[PDB]
Amino acid sequence: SSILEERILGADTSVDLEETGRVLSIGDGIARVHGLRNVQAEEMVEFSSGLKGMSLNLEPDNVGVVVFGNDKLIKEGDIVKRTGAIVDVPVGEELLGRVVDALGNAIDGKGPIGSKTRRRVGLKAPGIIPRISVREPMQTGIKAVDSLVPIGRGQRELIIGDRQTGKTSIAIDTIINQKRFNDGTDEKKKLYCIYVAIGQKRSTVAQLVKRLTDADAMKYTIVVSATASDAAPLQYLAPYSGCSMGEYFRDNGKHALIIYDDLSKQAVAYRQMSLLLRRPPGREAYPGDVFYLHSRLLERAAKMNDAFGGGSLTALPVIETQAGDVSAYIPTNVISITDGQIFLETELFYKGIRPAINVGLSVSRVGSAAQTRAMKQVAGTMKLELAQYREVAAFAQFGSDLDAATQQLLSRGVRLTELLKQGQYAPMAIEEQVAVIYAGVRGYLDKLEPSKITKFENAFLSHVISQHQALLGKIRADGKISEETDAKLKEIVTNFLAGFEA
Amino acid sequence: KTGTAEVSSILEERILGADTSVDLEETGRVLSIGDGIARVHGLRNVQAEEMVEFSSGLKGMSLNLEPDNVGVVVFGNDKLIKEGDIVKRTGAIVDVPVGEELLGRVVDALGNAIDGKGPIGSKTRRRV
Amino acid sequence: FAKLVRPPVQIYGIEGRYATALYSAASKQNKLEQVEKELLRVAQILKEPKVAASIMNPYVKRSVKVKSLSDMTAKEKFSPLTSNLINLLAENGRLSSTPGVISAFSTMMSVHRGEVPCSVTTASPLDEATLTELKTVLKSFLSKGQILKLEVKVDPSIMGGMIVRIGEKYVDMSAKTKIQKLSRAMR
Amino acid sequence: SVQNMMRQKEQEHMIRWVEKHVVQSISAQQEKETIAKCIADLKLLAKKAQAQ
Amino acid sequence: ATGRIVAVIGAVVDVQFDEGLPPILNALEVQGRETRLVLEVAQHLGESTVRTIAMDGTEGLVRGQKVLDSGAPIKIPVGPETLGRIMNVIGEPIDERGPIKTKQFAAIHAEAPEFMEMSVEQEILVTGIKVVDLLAPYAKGGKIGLFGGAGVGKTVLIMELINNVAKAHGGYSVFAGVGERTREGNDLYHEMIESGVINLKDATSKVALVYGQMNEPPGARARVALTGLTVAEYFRDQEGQDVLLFIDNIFRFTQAGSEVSALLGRIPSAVGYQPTLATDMGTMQERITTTKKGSITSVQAIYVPADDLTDPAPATTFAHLDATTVLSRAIAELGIYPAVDPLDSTSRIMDPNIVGSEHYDVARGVQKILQDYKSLQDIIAILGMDELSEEDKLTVSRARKIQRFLSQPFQVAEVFTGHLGKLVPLKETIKGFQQILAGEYDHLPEQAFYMVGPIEEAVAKADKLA
Amino acid sequence: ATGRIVAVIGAVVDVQFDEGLPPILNALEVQGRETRLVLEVAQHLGESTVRTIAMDGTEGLVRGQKVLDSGAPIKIPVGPETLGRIMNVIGEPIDERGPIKTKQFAAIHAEAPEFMEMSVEQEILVTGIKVVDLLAPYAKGGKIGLFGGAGVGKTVLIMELINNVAKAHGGYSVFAGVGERTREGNDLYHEMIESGVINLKDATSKVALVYGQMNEPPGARARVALTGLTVAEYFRDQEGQDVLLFIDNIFRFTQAGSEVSALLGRIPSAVGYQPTLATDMGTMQERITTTKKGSITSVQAIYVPADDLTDPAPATTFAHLDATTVLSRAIAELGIYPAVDPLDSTSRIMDPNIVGSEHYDVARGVQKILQDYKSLQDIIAILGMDELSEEDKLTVSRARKIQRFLSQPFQVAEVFTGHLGKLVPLKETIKGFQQILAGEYDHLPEQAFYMVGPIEEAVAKADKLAEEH
Ligand SMILES: Nc1ncnc2c1ncn2[C@@H]1O[C@H](COP(=O)(O)OP(=O)(O)OP(=O)(O)O)[C@@H](O)[C@H]1O
Ligand SMILES: Nc1ncnc2c1ncn2[C@@H]1O[C@H](COP(=O)(O)OP(=O)(O)O)[C@@H](O)[C@H]1O
Ligand SMILES: Nc1ncnc2c1ncn2[C@@H]1O[C@H](COP(=O)(O)OP(=O)(O)O)[C@@H](O)[C@H]1O
Ligand SMILES: [Mg+2]
Ligand SMILES: [Mg+2]
Ligand SMILES: [Mg+2]
């Protein structure tokens, strides 16, 4: 076969003097190395068998080293070499559509990635001059997110909640929903995505690449993967490597997005890795600088000014909490780095509100209110009509009857609550959202039954995409819902309501 | 186990000869200062809870009598003490002015004067 | 306190505390090349079934191990500053680590003219025409007025080369280069 | 899907045949090792020359 | 290749070699004992000295006692002759029926499968239990956990998924006992011989057995779970079968790993566990996989310490599962057996396209009526039932008919209470809950929905009391 | 005296000096780097080795590297030419306008002025807010702390007082950013270029900025609290002027001292803080005082972690302050903005001899009717609203009228809510609240009072609601 022989003539057998430190111990991943005089801190050192490692502690006698791999091929008396480089990963657009490990080697088997430029995992966030405020929107296609808790481009938003409530699905409808902009024509409405899998078994990450490839979502993302089987210095290095492929886009013009799933598993890989280096424990045996661990990460998510390129880098960190308690140590340290949050609960998921977003508590510094112009009209009034609902709609035990007074307002909420529910891996558009939200707030649904609105939605939505395609194209193009555009929609809802149930 | 006063400069003179140049019965040099706690090599005759008096003018109080050094808390700033500064003795537990010349005056915790009228005129003392 | 001469090794631990207090004290008065001749004569009288019977015995007395060695260290050959040092270790409780200090003082005194030798690790030994080059082409590297030394250890798992370590250098040319042909199997 | 799987089972066997056969071929030689040592001297003679 | 014992602390023997240091996780053979004593290298403490963890007891060892180097890890005999035989941590027959003669041997320590050897295909394994078929369906090739305290039912539940799945299975089976009691490991031998699964006389046996119980030293309980995990990989990769795997209990892989981690010289993490709690678990659990060469259907019982689900040893197992059956104590104080928490149990195949869109709506619609009974327990406990509306006296009376209609009599529990074990099919539970949600049985009392099988026994039990 | 590096473990570098040992609290200059890395001495260990703390990143630090010495603590620029600038912790420009050309430097380690240099007088200060000016009034020269959790309104309430007071003021102001979001440090640089407080071409700016944010190593997030009140002390002592001190956030000074405590070599105290909490804090919070050479009016934002006020980092700050405004979260969930708790804020000058015996009788009846509310809210949860007597119904209606009237639309909520901003004078604030307690607005709906200014705007809304009915 011609492929094996051409791989062996391209191999370079270069030999040079190394700089070399004999091993004194090896246990549980830490290799105290005698020698290694001129070593830097955070330098990448290379064992004899092909392993790789990073020298963290410097000390007068020994040199502490942690291993990127497995510590059973390493025996006392081995040889540790010097590369001569603080730890760096490859970068580029050439990694797009791949699954890679935490140092940039492909675990999909499509071959060697041809990459040209290398970028550190420990670089610095930009300061005060080269930013700008948040001008643009980032559409998720969820209807409880886009209307009530909008997210700008360049804003760190925290998805927080328990296990098995919707934290991964929320951030995968977002990956799917940008399919419509990426095959379009303008280069400033796209959104290239990145998913970082920390502490997850391979029978979830090889299954999420399936869900992202029938919908052809994988042609514009990267998956940096550090599974639960990996060395504890490989789950620590993963978000600092994934964030550094995001800043190929942001430092060259485009717009990126990055999900850390999750960041409660980049902390217990720092607690273990830095207890076996004999560093004294803090609270819950976490180190002193877990706040400095997350903060030097979540400040690269910038929004540059237009004299640098104007690119953005959103971030969506996921956080799993125990028993729904938000006052823990690692939650509160990362609530106060992000601009806004999305509080996912369990009693919302089980009563029926799915996606289970607490729209009361899901606060957001609105991002210079870049919702969009037409959604401001219909979800401006929706925000207040739902807020009016929640103050007054928690009895479950009625004794008196005020249908002219109270029962009209709470009938507007259940029509807007059951409108907000959604499916899974089928995200809408924004003008298909303006139409369905128009029909809810304008009183055109109070003569239905609430057990029929989820049935009313898909029959409505199929009618407008089929028969009214030139209608929705004037909302997406002109931005606003104009007064003559208010006129045309006034018949369509009432013509359909005249013949919906028959 | 290494011991605090086993540094490379303490052992180095004892290989040369006897320690006649410093007496160590009354004055002792400082091994290591940090965050208001000093370590002093020498001072063999220091009583427990005795004021000492550093080289830069500050004061002290002896709290840890240990088999190779003494650990003394420092009154005041620590940017005046260093490594190699001779410490001396006063010879008593700390004492404060006491009388009726205090009435109407404002004093700190060592009996000094802060209100700027003038020095206290008492003719008595007392151990705290 | 005073400043002291920097030893060119600077080891650490309970050895290098005492093994630098001896190097600094003897470099004063230029007692350096002499004192190694005296430390190699206590390096023979320590190994004795009456001397080592109480140099590491806990239960004799705290005091009588001080007079018994001070009478011993003075009468036979020498009364330098080492007679205070043996009296210094014995007064503190570090008599167990006494062979450690002289093995620490020897490696500290060796580098004042020495090399920290290389380690050729190839195969069954060689002839004179290929070894006297490597005992001379290994002198062309250093170039600082020195007289080199060396160790040899035979290993067959290295199939076809030699490794050498001038200090911490490790120029490796061996049969590791079969594992470097993973790139043929690595796409 | 049959064409690709029979290439993969053949590929790994082809690699190990070249790999496991070279272990004995490098072990048997006894004259070329003396040739291999003098170039190993000449590489080290070349190596220290570019440093100083 | 020889060395002498230098220090002994419990089950952490120190041993100094002179040349030929063993690499990590070799085996060492202690000479001069009546039994076999195998030491497995853990560390390398500097200047030709290793620190080992011993598999059997260390009493009677003296310093200087010789120790010999094997050359390889703990290997066990694996093959088709392992069926019907009981083993221990080093693979010796403890059934007193003679040696195990196979052609090959398998090491205890091997790596994990790669990314491109995973199989994503999901199905449904119908069991015959109503709580699991409806709300949280198991798959055919995925990991399952049964979380529970002490005295709730994590093994009566695992004796059913043998009695319902290992009978109608076609391939082989592997059981492992890690740190649970020994009379229960004797009543699995005298219940699989009687029922034809163990054949003492020829080669027609289906199940293998591997045992390390709660009398061993903690260097054995920490490694018996990697032993049954190796006999259930030969039956996957080299024979190509569809193997089951039942593990009880997998907590003691971790409880007995923080008893030898203090003596290796490590600063402890939170509430007392080892610093490496969640890397050794992700190296044992990352080998129990369905792959492209076979399929292992895991069922693991997991213990929660002092009835706490936020403890670090249970709460890091959750990322390694597919299904989940959190049991509960306060449920089982009422009498609902299997005491499954319907609100805490999940799956990844509960989906309208996989489990069928009719089933998916009885699923989510019966959690909705169950949550709304929980969300009024503040007011019912203080104030009363009698200060409620008329719509919310009809999510209270309908969600007490649904709780009782999740308790089923099991086959293994006939000997306790004297009631016939019932198996329901899948299609007669969906049909039987739509007739409590639509409101057809709102006249029958709630003592009739209790401990019955299919729904026609509920109207029959209601027919009895009159 | 050039030392050498031996042990870089985290952000704690240890150096070894051949000739001259430097004292505690100095500055050291690591050679051979293209950026300026400054290390400050903190301990003396024995055999001429010290234990320092870096002010930057510790990557690329090879052992055996030379270390110079300057002879003093860190020397920043100071003077009049530091106005309309943004500055680093070691006194450098970070805004890309060029260097700071001053003729006077001030080393950042000074001592607290003595007992005989203490101005004693109290005043009042009017900001325009109906909860500050009525219930916890400020003082000209006092010290003011803004408590409360995360997301309750502390960057808004501190940027509204920059609008209210620090534009109508003759003296100068300093904003020191001790570890916060670098996004929020770009608004206030641009919110005050268009508002005239910073002028980028001439020399009539009236503010100075100090910014070390939360992307910085935790040894440099402990010394921007001290670069602040060294520029804000040259304006008080040297020039005889009047200054304002704005610091956000001062909890990041304490909390970045717990990140290097055990790496220095101390045994950690209670819940995880360093054992020198109330000593390194009170070394700093005594240099912010008004002496008899000038005055300082200090406003500091104080993060309360996890809404836990009994935490040791806030509860040792309640003594260095004259005025506390405590924002709660259970109030801002009701839409009331500013979130300020009425029953937990407190000032010293709430006194019938400074604010007058009409201001005092009002604000001790607002707080007395709000504590009368909470004893009724436990009855409503069981008896319901239509069981109460006719006197207790009158209490809840006024108390909900007072609670809605304490809310006020700020001018910086003109991008969040779309309302228009108010600025209420003090004489109207006392008169408006005096009448709701009397009964002279018992005939209105509560939605009139929400988000107005003076009481005459709260009847111009109850007529528009009745016309559009
Ligand atoms: N929009 C939705 N509507 C209804 N159900 C959903 C929706 N999205 C997800 N689910 C279901 O909720 C369950 C949990 O979702 P997901 O796996 O994203 O939770 P998670 O918290 O990320 O899980 P983990 O805790 O393992 O990370 C899944 O079974 C999924 O099918
Ligand atoms: N399905 C069931 N029906 C009746 N009783 C049960 C059932 N499951 C468990 N129990 C009771 O609970 C106990 C559970 O103990 P067991 O399952 O043996 O171990 P564990 O303590 O691990 O749960 C049993 O002894 C039995 O008395
Ligand atoms: N007038 C207002 N009063 C109360 N909150 C407001 C007002 N205007 C906006 N907000 C919202 O309240 C939030 C308060 O957050 P902010 O004060 O910026 O930070 P911090 O977390 O330091 O309190 C902001 O995100 C903003 O969206
Ligand atoms: Mg998830
Ligand atoms: Mg059990
Ligand atoms: Mg803020």
Locate the domains of chain A by residue range.
16-85, 86-371, 372-501
CB B40 within 8 A of CB B27: no
Strand-pairing partners, residue A120, are A88
User: Residues 6 or more apart from A141 whose CB is under 8 A from it?
Assistant: A173, A174, A176, A177, A427, A428, A429
Any atom of ligand 1 within 6 Å of the Cβ of A354: yes
Which residues of C are less than 8 Å from B2 in CB distance?
A: 14, 17
Parallel/antiparallel/unpaired status of strands F143-146 and F295-301: parallel
As a whole number of angstroms, the longest Cα–Cα distance in chain B is 60
**Residue E138 structure tokens:** 């198991």
Parallel/antiparallel/unpaired status of strands F323-325 and F172-178: unpaired
A79, HSE (Cβ side, Cα atoms, 13 Å):
17
d(CA F362, CA F435): 10
* DSSP one-letter code for E340: B
Please give the helix or strand (H or E) that residue F66 lies within, else none: strand F66-69
Strand-pairing partners, residue E67, are E3, E30
Give F10-29 as a DSSP string.
Answer: SS-EEEEESS----SS--EE
d(CA A382, CA A148): 8
Between the CA of E95 and the centroid of ligand 5 the distance, in Å, is 23
Instruction: Report which of C25, C26, C14, C23 is spatially closest to residue C109, judged by C-alpha positions.
Output: C23
E29 is catalytic: no
Instruction: Report which of A137, A375, A358, A166 is spatially closest to residue A257, judged by C-alpha positions.
Output: A137
* DSSP one-letter code for F197: S
Ligand 2 first shell, C-beta below 6 A: E 148, 150-156, 337-338, 410, 413, 416
Residues with a beta carbon under 5 angstroms from ion ligand 5: E 155
- Cα–Cα distances (Å) from C102 to B72, C81, C105, E46, in that order, read 37, 15, 5, 21
d(CA F437, CA F432): 9
CB A209 within 8 A of CB A218: yes
**Sequence-ordered alpha helix ranges (H) in F213-290:** 224-233, 251-254, 261-264, 277-284
Q: Looking at domain A86-371, which of 3.40.630.30, 3.30.930.10, 3.40.50.300, 3.60.15.10 is its CATH number?
A: 3.40.50.300
Subunit contact F415:A369, Cβ cutoff 8 A: yes
Subunit contact D36:C160, Cβ cutoff 8 A: yes
| Domain of C102, in residue numbers | 1-112
Between the CA of A333 and the centroid of ligand 6 the distance, in Å, is 14
- Cα–Cα distances (Å) from F122 to F141, F347, F353, F354, in that order, read 8, 12, 11, 8
CB C15 within 8 A of CB F31: no
In chain A, the residue whose alpha carbon lies closest to the alpha carbon of F7 is: A59
Q: Where are the beta strands (DSSP E) in F315-397?
A: 323-325
CA E84 remoteness from chain centre: 21
d(CA E147, CA E141): 19
CB E220 within 8 A of CB E252: no
Parallel/antiparallel/unpaired status of strands E173-178 and E242-248: parallel
CB A225 within 8 A of CB A195: no
Burial of F338 by CB count in 10 Å (0-12 exposed, 13-18 middle, 19+ buried)? Answer: buried
Any atom of ligand 3 within 6 Å of the Cβ of A365: yes
Method: cryo-EM
Instruction: Report which of C104, C110, C136, C131 is spatially closest to residue C120, judged by C-alpha positions.
Output: C131
**Residue E122 structure tokens:** 């999901």
> Chain B: which residues have CB within 8 Å of chain F?
7-9, 31-35, 77-84, 106, 114-116
Fold of F1-73: Thrombin, subunit H (2.40.10)
Give B12-41 as a DSSP string.
Answer: HHHHH----SS--SS-BEEEEEETTEEEEE
E336, HSE (Cβ side, Cα atoms, 13 Å):
20
Tokens 């060796």 belong to C110
CA A36 remoteness from chain centre: 40
* DSSP one-letter code for F216: S
The CATH number of the domain covering residues in B23-92: 2.40.30.20
Subunit contact E113:A202, Cβ cutoff 8 A: yes
Instruction: Report which of E377, E414, E413 is spatially closest to residue E396, judged by C-alpha positions.
Output: E377
Burial of F386 by CB count in 10 Å (0-12 exposed, 13-18 middle, 19+ buried)? Answer: exposed
Fold of F350-466: 1.10.1140
The CATH number of the domain covering residues in F74-349: 3.40.50.300
Give me the amino acid identity at A301.
A
F-facing residues of C in 4-63 (CB < 8 A) are 6
- For chain E, the structural domain boundaries read 1-73, 74-349, 350-466
Question: Under DSSP, is residue F87 helix (H, G, I), strand (E, B) or coil?
Answer: strand
By residue count, chain A amounts to 502
Catalytic residue (choose from F180, F221, F398, F404): F180
Instruction: Report which of A177, A183, A182, A192 is spatially closest to residue A252, judged by C-alpha positions.
Output: A192
Q: How does C101-111 read in b/e, with b if 16+ C-beta sit within 10 Å? A: bbebbebbbee
C17 and C91 share one domain: yes
Backbone angles phi and psi of F158, in degrees to 5: -95, -20
Instruction: Report which of C149, C32, C34, C39 is spatially closest to residue C103, judged by C-alpha positions.
Output: C39
Between the CA of E338 and the centroid of ligand 2 the distance, in Å, is 9
Please give the helix or strand (H or E) that residue E246 lies within, else none: strand E242-248
d(CA A412, CA A389): 8
**Residue B15 structure tokens:** 């290989």
CB E252 within 8 A of CB E238: no
Tokens 């937990």 belong to F344
**Residue F214 structure tokens:** 């939360």
Torsion angle (degrees, nearest 10) of CA B99, B101, B105, B108: -40
User: Residues 6 or more apart from A316 whose CB is under 8 A from it?
Assistant: A157, A158, A159, A171, A174, A257, A258, A259, A260
The CATH number of the domain covering residues in A372-501: 1.20.150.20
Please give the helix or strand (H or E) that residue F178 lies within, else none: strand F172-178
As a whole number of angstroms, the longest Cα–Cα distance in chain E is 87
CB F124 within 8 A of CB F354: yes
E269, HSE (Cβ side, Cα atoms, 13 Å):
22
Provide the resolution (angstroms).
6.2
**Residue E147 structure tokens:** 């979380």
End-to-end CA gap in chain A: 70
The 3-class SS string of chain C reads: CCCCCCCCCCCCHHHHHHHHHHHHHHHHHHCHHHHHHHHCCHHHHCCCCCCHHHCCCCCCCCCHHHHHHHHHHHHCCCCCCHHHHHHHHHHHCCCCCHHHHHHHHHHHHHCCCCCCCEEEECCCCCCCCCHHHHCCCCHHHHCCCCCCCEEECCCCCCCCCEEECCCCCCEEECHHHHHHHHCCCCC
Instruction: Report which of E237, F290, B16, A436 is spatially closest to residue C21, judged by C-alpha positions.
Output: B16
d(CA E144, CA E299): 5
E154 is catalytic: yes
Question: Under DSSP, is residue A21 helix (H, G, I), strand (E, B) or coil?
Answer: strand
Q: Which of A439-448's residues contact partners 24+ apart within 8 Å by CB, and which partners?
A: A439/A493, A440/A382, A440/A415, A440/A416, A441/A378, A441/A381, A441/A382, A441/A385, A441/A412, A441/A416, A442/A493, A444/A493, A444/A494, A444/A497, A445/A415, A446/A411, A446/A412, A446/A415, A447/A497, A448/A415
**Sequence-ordered alpha helix ranges (H) in A33-125:** none
Question: Under DSSP, is residue F177 helix (H, G, I), strand (E, B) or coil?
Answer: strand
Strand-pairing partners, residue F300, are F145, F247
By residue count, chain B amounts to 128
E-facing residues of A in 47-66 (CB < 8 A) are none
Strand-pairing partners, residue B60, are B74
Q: Which of E325-330's residues contact partners 24+ apart within 8 Å by CB, and which partners?
A: E325/E131, E325/E132, E325/E136, E325/E144, E325/E145, E325/E146, E325/E147, E325/E157, E326/E147, E326/E148, E327/E146, E327/E147, E327/E148, E327/E149, E327/E152, E327/E153, E327/E154, E327/E157, E328/E148, E328/E152, E329/E149, E329/E151, E329/E152
- Cα–Cα distances (Å) from F326 to E307, F159, F160, in that order, read 40, 16, 16
* DSSP one-letter code for A40: P
Instruction: Report which of A348, A351, A391, A315 is spatially closest to residue A153, judged by C-alpha positions.
Output: A315
CB F232 within 8 A of CB F245: yes
Q: Is the dihedral of CA E210, E215, E216, E221 positive or negative?
A: positive
Which residues of B are less than 8 Å from C81 in CB distance?
A: 15-16
- Cα–Cα distances (Å) from C139 to C127, E243, F181, in that order, read 19, 66, 60
User: Residues 6 or more apart from F47 whose CB is under 8 A from it?
Assistant: B7, B8, B9, F16
Taking residue B4's Cβ as centre, other Cβ atoms within 10 Å add up to 16
CB E274 within 8 A of CB A272: no
Taking residue F344's Cβ as centre, other Cβ atoms within 10 Å add up to 15
CB F341 within 8 A of CB F152: no
As a whole number of angstroms, the longest Cα–Cα distance in chain D is 60
Strand-pairing partners, residue A304, are A131
Tokens 């003897």 belong to C26
C-alpha angle with apex E137: E136 to E138, nearest 5 degrees? 120
Tokens 């449920």 belong to E331
